[PDB]
Amino acid sequence: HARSTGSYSLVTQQPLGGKAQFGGQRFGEMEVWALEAYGAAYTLQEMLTVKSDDVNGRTKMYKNIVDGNHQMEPGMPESFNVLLKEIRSLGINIELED
Amino acid sequence: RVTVQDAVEKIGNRFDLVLVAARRARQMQVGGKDPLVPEENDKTTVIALREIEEGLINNQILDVRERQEQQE
Amino acid sequence: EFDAIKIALASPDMIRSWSFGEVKKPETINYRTFKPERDGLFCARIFGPVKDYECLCGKYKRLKHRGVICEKCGVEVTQTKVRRERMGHIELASPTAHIWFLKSLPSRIGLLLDMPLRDIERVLYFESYVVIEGGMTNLERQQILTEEQYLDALEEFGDEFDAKMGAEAIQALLKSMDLEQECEQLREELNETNSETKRKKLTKRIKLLEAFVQSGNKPEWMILTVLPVLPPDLRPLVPLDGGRFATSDLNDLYRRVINRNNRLKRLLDLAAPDIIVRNEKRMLQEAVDALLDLADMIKGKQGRFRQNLLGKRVDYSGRSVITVGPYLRLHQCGLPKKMALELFKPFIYGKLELRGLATTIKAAKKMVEREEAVVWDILDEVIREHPVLLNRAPTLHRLGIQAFEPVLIEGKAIQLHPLVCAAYNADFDGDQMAVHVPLTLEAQLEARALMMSTNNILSPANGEPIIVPSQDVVLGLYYMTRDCVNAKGEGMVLTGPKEAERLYRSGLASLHARVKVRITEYEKDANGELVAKTSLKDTTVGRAILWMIVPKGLPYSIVNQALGKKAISKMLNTCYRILGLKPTVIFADQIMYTGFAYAARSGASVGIDDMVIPEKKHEIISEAEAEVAEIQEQFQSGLVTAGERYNKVIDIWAAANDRVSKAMMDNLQTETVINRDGQEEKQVSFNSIYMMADSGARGSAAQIRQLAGMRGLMAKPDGSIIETPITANFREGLNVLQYFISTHGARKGLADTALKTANSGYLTRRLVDVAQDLVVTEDDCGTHEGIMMTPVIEGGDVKEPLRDRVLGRVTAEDVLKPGTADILVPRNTLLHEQWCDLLEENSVDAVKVRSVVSCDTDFGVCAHCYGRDLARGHIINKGEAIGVIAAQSIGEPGTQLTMSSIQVKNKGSIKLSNVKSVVNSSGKLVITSRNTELKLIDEFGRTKESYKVPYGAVLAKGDGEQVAGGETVANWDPHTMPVITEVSGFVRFTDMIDGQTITRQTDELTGLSSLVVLDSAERTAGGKDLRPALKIVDAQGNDVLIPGTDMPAQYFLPGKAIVQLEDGVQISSGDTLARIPQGGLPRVADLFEARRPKEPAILAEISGIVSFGKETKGKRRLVITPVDGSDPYEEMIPKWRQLNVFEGERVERGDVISDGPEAPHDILRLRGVHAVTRYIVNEVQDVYRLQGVKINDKHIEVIVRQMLRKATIVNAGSSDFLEGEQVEYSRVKIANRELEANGKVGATYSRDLLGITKASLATESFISAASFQETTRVLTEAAVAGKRDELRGLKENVIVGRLIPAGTGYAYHQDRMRRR
DNA sequence: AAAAAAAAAAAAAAAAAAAAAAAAAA
DNA sequence: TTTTTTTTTTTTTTTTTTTTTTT
Ligand SMILES: [Mg+2]
Ligand SMILES: [Zn+2]
Ligand SMILES: [Zn+2]
């Protein structure tokens, strides 16, 4: 079972799992440790920001790929902002700085 | 390329190798700055690594080329 | 984008600003039209449109009306994303106390107001009252009341005095607190008060209050007044497959909260009685509690931090069952065509668009769907050289993900290089591997330069190659090079390997026949110049054929052996070390090819006749039966006990099992008895099973043993080995009961495997969590301190030589060979195999070497402190994160784990470490020092042995002498605690009161009785204070003066002692005066958590003479008086332990008082950081060595460094720290360094070993801990402290989604930090 | 008929930590 | 008779998804 780009989850814009849904594999905690065990940094950022979470990022990467460019635009993980909003829902005041 | 250990022999850091290779490949991929070494129907990555092996690429040639480009 | 992130507590004004309206309706939609209800949970005019750039009423469906809000429905025509971003709020009629601060244990509001949590809970739950501004009344400010006392206060103080109950009361309390007076009075009390619990609570409160005033916060903010509400998008109303709605409980909780708040407002409008509104307020508080504790969304294995931030599903992925293929090269792996065409679909579309074969991307879509032959050429173009990551399921070590060049192949299985399988721990019984695709040029170069399988042929755990050929290649090679006495082509001469191959393949010559040939070997002994040497070599035909595959540099003798598994492994290691990397990769591919091919040519099958049952099995078994029957009848007659009979039977069964083992090995290994072209000759056997066991392909002597000979003796459920062992073996039949016993043996092993893996996962989890931050940052700290490195001997042969320990590290001080004043190497030069061998031949016994735990690096580790980066030759690079690789190396082998006298052997001189001896009466040399040790220095001069000699031993020889090999010298009596005497003289009865202190017990066997000293309790209290004292006196009766001091020789015995001698008998030096009566993975987990063992062996807290204190006041008190220092310290001891120190002993600080397991914390506070890390690394290394797995000490060392990252202050010094404060070590280090560089003075600190989880919680970066092992506590602390996040480590940056400052990204960080 | 918790199965094993109770004074 | 220390006891953490009861 494989995938290139299909429907994402609603609550968090992440690729679906499983086989019944046309999903993608899980880059789990252990895999992240194994990646950062190397000096591999850009690949991890691509895995967990542009290929899985960043709603605007992945669309732009797709468009660049179709245009022969392999350029990465950082943006920000969507689920990160989701977590920020959720914890702001509690009695917690968290914000971003300069 | 079987491996890039020779590139490390040329640039012992093993990390700036990746940065310079990616910079050269990005510059020569999107447009302009044609590769200076013959290719083998390979992607920009492989030819950039081969050029780093050949020694014509280093940590200074990219900077001086950018400076000359800036000067014009 | 943002260098750092900040956190603070919620304020009503900020809550109002965040929201964009009040959701007054506890409703979903109008349920009369399809227009969502006004100010409902899904409110358009509060949040935004449901459809992009279209109003709810449809007034403006056009972009030109962007920004302008309608009036018919009041919906601001924007993108639907505004619904995701815009929040909401609920104005609560009654204030609500936030619940996280209520049950945090310790509660924030709890100790902030300095009242018990029970009273706070009772007050908030509307079942009590509290005092607000008691004033001139009988009621204290913090006093709480009940309904009866409320009525009493009303009757007596219904005037100005006032009180409340619940949320409003607590809000009034918080609003009516100052902070200046609180801080001042609390500081005064801390300075004056000297009680541990009050002092601790007071300093905790001072820290909380000073942090709060430092932060821009007010206590009332911790009580909710306006409740924020999540954007509707994050709480979607998903309809199930039909006419129904099934969304999260969040919508239900919000509906409940809004309904209850509306009901409370309505009742307050109605002015209901206080009881009904009280119930309403309590219900509203419960509803807010249920809505808040979101926690689960943030908590749990399925929380945002762990399920959606760290471990994130990713596109461009796939998976499949794996399968073998020889034809692949190590730098590439196969790939099913379908997954190739599916993964690179964006890439193929782009390549087709650029190629011009199509214009609209839909044309390329229809092309790929049609499977047009053009698409395959595009696939070969994109796949040309474009690595992909092949990852297995349990990613334990960094090798769990390796890059590979795809090679499109038909089928549906991920073909894998065979060799690399060994690294993955991947067997082909159906395991499923995942394929990921790097996208960007950064990532492609990153995968090819680091994760390519070529770049990883040396493991990070240790220097052993990881590409060790596994099972089939090894058997083929071994069968290719193995001499038989005679065969076709035996006894000729070959001009070279080429015609050897020609002869074998033609069938004219056997694959192996001892024969002389001509081989040319190339050697680079000169300055990197190849020299050719050739001559006649006696070898084997298959061996000569193999020689064509070795590169030039290697010698020839390397392939003149049988080439077992270990031989091939070290042969590849030699190739890697002498010829670099590329030759080794080519050589590994070739060795796999030439192993599989000749294994195929061998036809090494296994039939049932390949395992012969030795004839002695029956006879050995029958003799064993006769012996066990004889011992059984001997027990029947009563000559022995049941235990003695059991032990005897087990021992003889073990001996018979060994006999059968030896018989079977003799039968197998030299089975071959064939002609030599003469009469007869024996040779190493060609029996199939023996070949597959000797080569090391599969199994070993242990495994073959139960295929032919008896299985031995299996364990009944609890290891209690049955006295009727399995007399049968697998080749023969097994009866029913023997199989039942084997099931007993095997089910426990399977269940072990399962739960052991479960636990090892969590051990690795903690290990990586506690060593996330450490990233190599500095080349060298320029520090001279280090740890001593020596070979390890437990009391026998050396378990692990000095070379293995020292290899790959950086020396701290110059090596001083025993040619004293000979500078063998510089004091700070790296060490590798050549220098290691030079030290070895120099016979260097101990070396000072640099360790990360000693490094003076700031927020990191000095590179030279880490030495050689395993998995690569040269030294560590600037950046490569050591913490995660070290944690993985320590944790991965967790799966492999499983949950008298001395006879000196070698010949050498005798050395005594910590020597304090005396000549006994017989003339032998006894030891009067508990901590003395014996070294056997070989003739060379090095330490080849070391033995712990207990107190009062026996020695035939003396110091500085020589003992032949095997000469028993060390011996002692471990039964009774000796009372040996230092001097010689008469023995009186001094303070031996008979009838009150002691008793007379008669030895019935002989009649020669002996005085008996009872304990302190059994006798009278009057005799309790009367000490039993044995004093030595001279012939004249005068006291004997011990040399070195004026004190006489008096000995004080403990309770339950048996005094041997009587009055009127002289005693020599060293006479016993009284007969004194007397683990697997969990061990590693306990060790790294650094927990107090069951019996915390207590060491000497301070140097000085020792004495006893108050007796049986719960425990016995020992007081050590320093000779020149201060005595007043005391030590309580459970006196029922068999202590080691007498009453008149002078010992050094940190000397064992009661033996047993040693607590790490006391070891530090008594020995030192180097000593405790030595103990930890040695013990865990012993645990791993128990199973044979090898882990380089550096990883344990760095983990230990992280475990002690925290420390405590002993004095504030000229700084502004609190003495009772407890802070990160490097913080005080840099502070005191900058203070000392100036004219001021520094402070003093004591280090402590916080357990791996404990030290992990000390991580200042709350984001790390907020994602690790808890959310409640970490978030509570971050909120109260208002701790800004620095984003320095590796885990937090992953959460933020920016480049990790570990590998390549480090350079980028090195740029960004340069900006500021 | 409408609104609201979990008292309504559950316990193991072990550990960390907080609160209460019991020595042992002067 | 009060107060500090230690011990003991209670409670809260550590690797597949909600009806019945009351007003
Ligand atoms: Mg398997
Ligand atoms: Zn409208
Ligand atoms: Zn250092």
CSV table of N, CA, C and O in Angstrom, one decimal, chain A residues 1 3-4 8 12 14-15 22 25-27 29-31 33-34 36-43 46-49 51-53 78-79 81 85 87 89 91 93 95 98, chain C residues 3 5-6 8-9 18 84 87 98 298 304 308-309 311-315 317-319 342 391 395 398 401 437 440 446 456 765 768 772 885 888 1275 1294 1297 1299 1303-1304:
chain,number,residue,atom,x,y,z
A,1,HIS,N,0.9,-1.2,0.0
A,1,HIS,CA,0.0,0.0,0.0
A,1,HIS,C,0.9,1.2,0.0
A,1,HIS,O,1.8,1.3,0.8
A,3,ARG,N,1.1,5.7,-1.3
A,3,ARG,CA,0.3,7.0,-1.6
A,3,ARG,C,1.3,8.0,-2.1
A,3,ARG,O,2.5,8.0,-1.8
A,4,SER,N,0.8,9.0,-2.8
A,4,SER,CA,1.5,10.2,-3.1
A,4,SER,C,0.9,11.4,-2.5
A,4,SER,O,1.6,12.2,-1.8
A,8,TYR,N,-6.6,14.4,3.6
A,8,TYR,CA,-6.0,14.5,5.0
A,8,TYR,C,-7.1,14.5,6.0
A,8,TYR,O,-8.3,14.5,5.7
A,12,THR,N,-6.9,17.4,12.4
A,12,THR,CA,-5.6,17.8,12.1
A,12,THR,C,-5.3,17.5,10.6
A,12,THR,O,-5.7,16.4,10.2
A,14,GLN,N,-3.4,16.0,8.6
A,14,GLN,CA,-2.3,15.0,8.5
A,14,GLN,C,-2.8,13.9,7.6
A,14,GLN,O,-4.0,13.6,7.5
A,15,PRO,N,-1.9,13.2,7.0
A,15,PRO,CA,-2.3,12.0,6.1
A,15,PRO,C,-3.0,11.0,6.9
A,15,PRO,O,-2.6,10.7,8.1
A,22,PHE,N,-7.4,5.4,2.1
A,22,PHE,CA,-6.2,5.5,1.3
A,22,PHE,C,-5.2,6.4,2.0
A,22,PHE,O,-5.1,7.6,1.7
A,25,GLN,N,2.0,5.8,5.6
A,25,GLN,CA,2.6,5.2,6.8
A,25,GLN,C,2.8,6.2,7.9
A,25,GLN,O,2.5,7.4,7.8
A,26,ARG,N,3.2,5.7,9.0
A,26,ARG,CA,3.4,6.5,10.2
A,26,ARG,C,4.9,6.7,10.4
A,26,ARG,O,5.7,5.8,10.5
A,27,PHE,N,5.3,8.0,10.4
A,27,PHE,CA,6.7,8.4,10.8
A,27,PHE,C,6.7,8.6,12.3
A,27,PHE,O,6.4,9.7,12.8
A,29,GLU,N,7.7,8.2,16.6
A,29,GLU,CA,8.7,8.7,17.5
A,29,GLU,C,10.0,8.1,17.3
A,29,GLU,O,11.0,8.7,17.2
A,30,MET,N,10.0,6.7,17.2
A,30,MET,CA,11.3,6.0,17.1
A,30,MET,C,11.9,6.4,15.8
A,30,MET,O,13.2,6.5,15.7
A,31,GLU,N,11.2,6.5,14.7
A,31,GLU,CA,11.8,6.9,13.4
A,31,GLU,C,12.4,8.3,13.5
A,31,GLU,O,13.4,8.5,13.0
A,33,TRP,N,13.7,9.7,16.2
A,33,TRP,CA,15.0,9.5,16.9
A,33,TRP,C,16.0,9.0,16.0
A,33,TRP,O,17.1,9.5,16.0
A,34,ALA,N,15.7,7.9,15.2
A,34,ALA,CA,16.7,7.4,14.3
A,34,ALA,C,17.1,8.4,13.3
A,34,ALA,O,18.3,8.4,12.9
A,36,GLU,N,17.2,11.8,13.7
A,36,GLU,CA,18.1,12.8,14.4
A,36,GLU,C,19.4,12.1,14.9
A,36,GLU,O,20.3,12.8,15.3
A,37,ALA,N,19.4,10.8,15.1
A,37,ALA,CA,20.6,10.1,15.4
A,37,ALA,C,21.7,10.4,14.4
A,37,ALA,O,22.9,10.6,14.8
A,38,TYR,N,21.3,10.3,13.1
A,38,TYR,CA,22.2,10.8,12.1
A,38,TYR,C,22.3,12.4,12.2
A,38,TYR,O,21.7,13.0,13.1
A,39,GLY,N,23.0,13.0,11.3
A,39,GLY,CA,23.0,14.4,11.1
A,39,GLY,C,21.9,14.8,10.2
A,39,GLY,O,21.8,16.0,9.9
A,40,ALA,N,20.9,13.9,9.9
A,40,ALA,CA,19.9,14.3,9.0
A,40,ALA,C,18.9,15.2,9.6
A,40,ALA,O,18.2,14.8,10.5
A,41,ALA,N,18.9,16.5,9.2
A,41,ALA,CA,18.0,17.5,9.7
A,41,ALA,C,16.9,17.9,8.7
A,41,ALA,O,15.7,17.9,9.0
A,42,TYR,N,17.3,18.3,7.5
A,42,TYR,CA,16.4,18.7,6.5
A,42,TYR,C,15.3,17.7,6.2
A,42,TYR,O,14.1,18.0,6.1
A,43,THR,N,15.7,16.4,6.1
A,43,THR,CA,14.8,15.3,5.8
A,43,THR,C,13.7,15.2,6.9
A,43,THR,O,12.5,15.0,6.6
A,46,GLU,N,11.3,18.1,6.5
A,46,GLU,CA,10.4,17.8,5.4
A,46,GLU,C,9.3,16.8,5.8
A,46,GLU,O,8.1,16.9,5.5
A,47,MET,N,9.8,15.7,6.5
A,47,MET,CA,8.9,14.7,6.9
A,47,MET,C,7.7,15.2,7.8
A,47,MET,O,6.5,14.9,7.5
A,48,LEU,N,8.0,16.0,8.8
A,48,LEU,CA,7.1,16.4,9.8
A,48,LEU,C,6.6,17.8,9.7
A,48,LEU,O,5.8,18.3,10.6
A,49,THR,N,6.9,18.5,8.6
A,49,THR,CA,6.4,19.9,8.4
A,49,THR,C,5.7,20.0,7.0
A,49,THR,O,4.6,20.5,6.9
A,51,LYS,N,5.5,17.5,4.4
A,51,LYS,CA,4.9,16.3,3.8
A,51,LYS,C,3.7,15.8,4.6
A,51,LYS,O,3.0,14.9,4.2
A,52,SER,N,3.5,16.3,5.8
A,52,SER,CA,2.5,15.8,6.7
A,52,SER,C,1.6,16.8,7.3
A,52,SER,O,0.4,16.6,7.4
A,53,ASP,N,2.1,18.0,7.6
A,53,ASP,CA,1.3,19.0,8.4
A,53,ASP,C,1.0,20.3,7.7
A,53,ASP,O,-0.1,20.7,7.6
A,78,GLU,N,0.6,23.1,10.8
A,78,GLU,CA,-0.8,23.5,11.1
A,78,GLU,C,-1.2,22.9,12.5
A,78,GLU,O,-1.8,23.6,13.3
A,79,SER,N,-0.9,21.6,12.8
A,79,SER,CA,-1.2,21.0,14.0
A,79,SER,C,-0.6,21.7,15.2
A,79,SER,O,-1.1,21.7,16.3
A,81,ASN,N,-0.3,25.0,15.4
A,81,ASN,CA,-1.2,26.1,15.7
A,81,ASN,C,-2.5,25.5,16.3
A,81,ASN,O,-3.1,26.2,17.2
A,85,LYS,N,-4.0,26.8,19.9
A,85,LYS,CA,-5.4,27.2,20.1
A,85,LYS,C,-6.0,26.4,21.2
A,85,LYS,O,-6.7,26.9,22.1
A,87,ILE,N,-4.6,24.8,23.8
A,87,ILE,CA,-4.1,25.1,25.1
A,87,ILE,C,-4.5,26.5,25.5
A,87,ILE,O,-4.7,26.8,26.7
A,89,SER,N,-7.4,27.5,24.9
A,89,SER,CA,-8.7,27.2,25.3
A,89,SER,C,-8.7,27.0,26.9
A,89,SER,O,-9.7,27.3,27.5
A,91,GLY,N,-7.0,27.7,30.7
A,91,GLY,CA,-6.6,28.9,31.3
A,91,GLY,C,-5.1,29.2,31.2
A,91,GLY,O,-4.4,29.6,32.2
A,93,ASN,N,-2.1,31.2,28.7
A,93,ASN,CA,-1.8,32.3,27.8
A,93,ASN,C,-0.4,32.0,27.2
A,93,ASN,O,0.6,32.3,27.8
A,95,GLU,N,1.9,32.6,23.6
A,95,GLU,CA,2.1,33.5,22.4
A,95,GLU,C,3.4,33.3,21.8
A,95,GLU,O,4.3,32.6,22.4
A,98,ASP,N,9.3,37.7,19.0
A,98,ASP,CA,10.0,38.2,17.9
A,98,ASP,C,10.8,37.1,17.2
A,98,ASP,O,11.4,36.2,17.9
C,3,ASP,N,12.6,33.3,17.2
C,3,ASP,CA,13.7,32.6,17.9
C,3,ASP,C,13.2,31.9,19.2
C,3,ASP,O,13.7,30.8,19.4
C,5,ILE,N,9.8,31.3,22.2
C,5,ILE,CA,8.4,31.3,22.5
C,5,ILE,C,8.2,31.6,24.0
C,5,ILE,O,9.0,31.2,24.8
C,6,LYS,N,7.0,32.2,24.3
C,6,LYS,CA,6.7,32.7,25.6
C,6,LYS,C,5.3,32.1,26.0
C,6,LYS,O,4.5,31.9,25.2
C,8,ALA,N,2.3,32.3,29.4
C,8,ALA,CA,1.8,33.0,30.6
C,8,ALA,C,0.4,32.5,30.9
C,8,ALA,O,-0.1,31.7,30.2
C,9,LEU,N,-0.1,33.0,32.1
C,9,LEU,CA,-1.4,32.6,32.5
C,9,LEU,C,-2.5,33.4,31.8
C,9,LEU,O,-2.2,34.5,31.2
C,18,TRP,N,-8.9,37.7,22.5
C,18,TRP,CA,-8.7,36.5,21.6
C,18,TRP,C,-10.1,36.2,21.0
C,18,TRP,O,-10.1,35.9,19.8
C,84,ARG,N,-11.3,28.3,11.5
C,84,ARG,CA,-10.3,27.6,12.3
C,84,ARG,C,-9.5,28.5,13.2
C,84,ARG,O,-9.2,28.1,14.4
C,87,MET,N,-11.5,32.3,17.7
C,87,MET,CA,-11.9,31.6,18.9
C,87,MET,C,-13.3,32.1,19.4
C,87,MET,O,-13.9,32.9,18.7
C,98,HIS,N,-10.2,27.6,38.1
C,98,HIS,CA,-9.6,26.6,37.1
C,98,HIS,C,-9.1,25.4,37.9
C,98,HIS,O,-8.6,25.5,39.0
C,298,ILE,N,-4.4,16.6,24.8
C,298,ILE,CA,-3.0,16.9,25.1
C,298,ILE,C,-2.3,15.8,25.8
C,298,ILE,O,-1.0,15.7,25.7
C,304,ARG,N,-1.8,15.3,21.4
C,304,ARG,CA,-1.2,16.0,20.3
C,304,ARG,C,0.3,16.0,20.2
C,304,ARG,O,0.9,15.8,19.1
C,308,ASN,N,0.5,13.5,17.1
C,308,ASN,CA,0.4,14.5,16.0
C,308,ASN,C,1.5,15.4,15.8
C,308,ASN,O,1.7,15.9,14.7
C,309,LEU,N,2.3,15.7,16.8
C,309,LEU,CA,3.5,16.5,16.7
C,309,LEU,C,4.8,15.7,16.4
C,309,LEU,O,5.5,16.0,15.5
C,311,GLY,N,5.2,12.0,16.4
C,311,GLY,CA,5.0,10.9,15.4
C,311,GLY,C,3.9,11.2,14.5
C,311,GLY,O,2.7,11.0,14.8
C,312,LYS,N,4.2,11.7,13.3
C,312,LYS,CA,3.3,12.2,12.3
C,312,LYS,C,3.2,11.3,11.1
C,312,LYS,O,4.3,11.1,10.5
C,313,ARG,N,2.0,10.9,10.7
C,313,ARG,CA,1.9,10.2,9.4
C,313,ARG,C,2.3,11.1,8.3
C,313,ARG,O,2.2,12.4,8.4
C,314,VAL,N,2.9,10.6,7.3
C,314,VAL,CA,3.5,11.4,6.2
C,314,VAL,C,3.1,10.8,4.8
C,314,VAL,O,3.0,9.6,4.6
C,315,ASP,N,2.9,11.8,3.9
C,315,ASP,CA,2.7,11.4,2.5
C,315,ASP,C,3.9,10.9,1.9
C,315,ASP,O,5.0,10.7,2.5
C,317,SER,N,4.7,7.9,1.1
C,317,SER,CA,5.0,6.8,1.9
C,317,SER,C,4.4,5.5,1.3
C,317,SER,O,3.5,5.6,0.4
C,318,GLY,N,4.9,4.4,1.8
C,318,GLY,CA,4.3,3.1,1.4
C,318,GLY,C,4.9,2.0,2.2
C,318,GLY,O,5.8,2.3,3.0
C,319,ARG,N,4.4,0.8,2.0
C,319,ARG,CA,4.9,-0.3,2.8
C,319,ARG,C,4.7,-1.6,2.0
C,319,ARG,O,3.9,-1.6,1.0
C,342,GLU,N,3.5,4.8,-8.0
C,342,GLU,CA,2.6,5.5,-7.1
C,342,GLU,C,3.2,6.5,-6.3
C,342,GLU,O,2.6,7.6,-6.0
C,391,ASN,N,12.6,1.6,6.0
C,391,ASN,CA,12.6,1.6,7.4
C,391,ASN,C,11.7,0.5,7.9
C,391,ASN,O,10.7,0.1,7.3
C,395,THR,N,11.9,0.7,15.0
C,395,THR,CA,13.2,1.5,14.8
C,395,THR,C,13.9,1.6,16.1
C,395,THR,O,13.6,2.6,16.9
C,398,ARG,N,19.9,3.9,15.1
C,398,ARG,CA,19.8,4.8,13.9
C,398,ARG,C,19.9,4.0,12.6
C,398,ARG,O,19.5,4.6,11.6
C,401,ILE,N,16.7,3.1,9.8
C,401,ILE,CA,16.4,3.8,8.5
C,401,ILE,C,17.6,3.9,7.7
C,401,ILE,O,18.6,4.6,8.2
C,437,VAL,N,10.1,8.7,0.6
C,437,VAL,CA,10.8,9.4,-0.5
C,437,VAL,C,11.3,10.7,0.0
C,437,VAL,O,10.5,11.5,0.4
C,440,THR,N,13.3,17.1,-1.4
C,440,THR,CA,14.0,18.3,-1.8
C,440,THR,C,15.5,17.9,-1.9
C,440,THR,O,16.0,17.0,-1.4
C,446,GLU,N,21.1,14.8,1.7
C,446,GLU,CA,21.2,14.4,3.0
C,446,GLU,C,21.1,12.8,3.1
C,446,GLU,O,21.8,12.2,4.0
C,456,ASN,N,27.3,3.4,6.0
C,456,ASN,CA,27.0,2.8,7.3
C,456,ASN,C,27.4,1.3,7.1
C,456,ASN,O,26.5,0.5,6.9
C,765,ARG,N,12.9,4.7,25.6
C,765,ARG,CA,12.2,6.0,25.6
C,765,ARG,C,12.8,6.9,26.7
C,765,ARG,O,13.1,8.1,26.3
C,768,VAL,N,16.5,8.1,25.6
C,768,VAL,CA,16.6,9.2,24.6
C,768,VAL,C,16.0,10.4,25.2
C,768,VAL,O,16.5,11.5,24.9
C,772,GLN,N,18.4,14.2,25.2
C,772,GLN,CA,18.1,14.9,24.0
C,772,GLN,C,18.9,16.1,23.7
C,772,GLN,O,19.4,16.3,22.6
C,885,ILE,N,22.1,9.0,19.7
C,885,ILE,CA,22.7,7.7,19.3
C,885,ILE,C,23.2,6.9,20.6
C,885,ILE,O,23.1,5.7,20.6
C,888,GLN,N,20.1,5.3,22.1
C,888,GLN,CA,19.7,4.2,21.3
C,888,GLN,C,20.6,3.0,21.5
C,888,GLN,O,20.1,1.8,21.6
C,1275,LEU,N,2.9,21.7,32.4
C,1275,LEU,CA,2.2,22.9,32.0
C,1275,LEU,C,1.9,23.8,33.2
C,1275,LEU,O,1.9,25.0,33.1
C,1294,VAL,N,11.7,20.1,17.1
C,1294,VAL,CA,10.9,19.2,16.3
C,1294,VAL,C,9.4,19.6,16.5
C,1294,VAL,O,8.6,19.6,15.5
C,1297,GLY,N,8.8,22.5,14.5
C,1297,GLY,CA,8.8,22.2,13.1
C,1297,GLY,C,9.9,22.9,12.3
C,1297,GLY,O,9.9,23.0,11.1
C,1299,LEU,N,14.4,23.5,11.8
C,1299,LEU,CA,15.5,22.7,11.6
C,1299,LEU,C,16.1,22.3,13.0
C,1299,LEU,O,16.3,23.1,13.9
C,1303,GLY,N,22.3,18.1,13.3
C,1303,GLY,CA,23.1,17.8,12.2
C,1303,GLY,C,23.4,18.9,11.3
C,1303,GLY,O,24.0,19.9,11.7
C,1304,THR,N,23.0,18.8,10.0
C,1304,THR,CA,23.2,19.8,9.1
C,1304,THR,C,22.6,21.2,9.6
C,1304,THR,O,23.3,22.2,9.5
